[PDB]
Design a protein around this ligand. Structure first.
Ligand SMILES: [Ca+2]
Ligand SMILES: [Ca+2]
Ligand SMILES: [Ca+2]
Ligand SMILES: [Ca+2]
Ligand SMILES: [Cu+2]
Ligand SMILES: [Cu+2]
Lengths: 91, 91
């Protein structure tokens, strides 16, 4: 409804377009995370292509080591991307 | 440049339209946070026009106790609001 709320809805929508693909409809496997990062965060994260970088993000986000990133764990990634977007407006 | 990246930039933009108003240009006073919450999140968080409700959210954000919500602290509100918006798409 407000522009902020539309941004919140959009982030949720984008999570879901990747989370539905395989396995649990509401969590991201590593493959789904990889597709999300590659496509949707291509200009935000350095070395986004490199394989090592994705295994390491994935391990960092998977706080309970069940090999899935749930919505709550995914929020840590949004936090990282928000800080960088903030940095980017000033630099 | 991606849709996700635009949403993240849009969130920063909205933080700045309130943070520049008074005192430090890059942090939110309780006054600026009040305005932001009531105008931009009016449909996302329960009963946000009560005085008691605004005060609670400010204190919870201001984690080092310096009377400002800087952008890093503001990311916690974004996290709260994302979880709320996620809960609402399924409920
Ligand atoms: Ca999945
Ligand atoms: Ca997990
Ligand atoms: Ca300010
Ligand atoms: Ca503070
Ligand atoms: Cu969901
Ligand atoms: Cu700023």
């Amino acid at each position: 409804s407000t522009k902020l709320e539309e941004h919140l809805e959009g982030i949720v929508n984008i999570f879901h377009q990747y989370s539905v693909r395989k396995g649990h409809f509401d969590t991201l496997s590593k493959g789904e995370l990889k597709q999300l990062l590659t496509k949707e965060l291509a200009n935000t994260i350095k070395n986004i292509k490199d394989k090592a970088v994705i295994d390491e993000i994935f391990q960092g986000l998977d706080a309970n080591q069940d090999e899935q990133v749930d919505f709550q764990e995914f929020i840590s990634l949004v936090a990282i991307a928000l800080k960088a977007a903030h940095y980017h407006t000033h630099k």
